[PDB]
Amino acid sequence: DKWEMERTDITMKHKLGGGQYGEVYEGVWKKYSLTVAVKTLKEDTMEVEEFLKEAAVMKEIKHPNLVQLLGVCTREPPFYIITEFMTYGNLLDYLRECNRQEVNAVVLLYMATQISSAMEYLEKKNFIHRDLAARNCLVGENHLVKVADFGLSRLMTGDTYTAHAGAKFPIKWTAPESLAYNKFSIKSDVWAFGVLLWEIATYGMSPYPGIDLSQVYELLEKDYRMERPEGCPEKVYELMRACWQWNPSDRPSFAEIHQAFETMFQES
Ligand SMILES: Cc1cc(Nc2ncc3cc(-c4c(Cl)cccc4Cl)c(=O)n(C)c3n2)ccc1F
Question: Which of 73, 99, 121, 191 has its CA 20 to 30 A from that of 176?
């Protein structure tokens, strides 16, 4: 289709992210003198059909706050997925290293509004993310934030995905039903979004600070939740706590979350 391009159109530069995102490189699309990001598969980091399906799914995603596909090379190996390049890197590092007078309260609402917009689109389009976290949000100039869209799964909005036996999760971002039963849904993405809000509010602190990973689930089942961060508006914390309702059904939708943030951003 229209997305297929010649591999030789791109010149590969260096690895991005220190391996955390797999085989991803900065590159140059020569014709346009345009920096792009390129993911490939040469070191057996995923299975071939999984990679090719990622590429297929990306073709369907079109939203201002989801990383945008530019093209693919899927005829013969090595296969490539080519996307827009986000200049800063990830939101976790961005928050940690930023000048807070610039990245101020208004900007944190702006960030939350952008990410919730992306998630509202995935909710509407029957996809789940499964790894929402600041390390998986990418930042460009002027505090533009886009959710990374590797790993998306198709799932009708009211259904559940069961992860493979033996799967290991990022415990501190993982909903209780996922931890206990390997069950994921758009509502487990909502849970993760609440943790992300806490990351934003703390300018990138590690969640459940000092708490043993093997005791996180136990704390959640006893109704422990992280306290409100310093400076965090009460309405924002209310939203975070709603994202952390034990029962998935009781958590807000992304459409509701995005509306709340848009309003707070517009009124700031
Ligand atoms: C300075 C710096 C910049 C970036 N930018 C960046 N821009 C675009 C992309 C696009 C990726 C992508 C791809 Cl190539 C294929 C499918 C889905 C996605 Cl999301 C992606 O995995 N990454 C990490 C990525 N990183 C990352 C780290 C860093 F230190």
Answer: 121
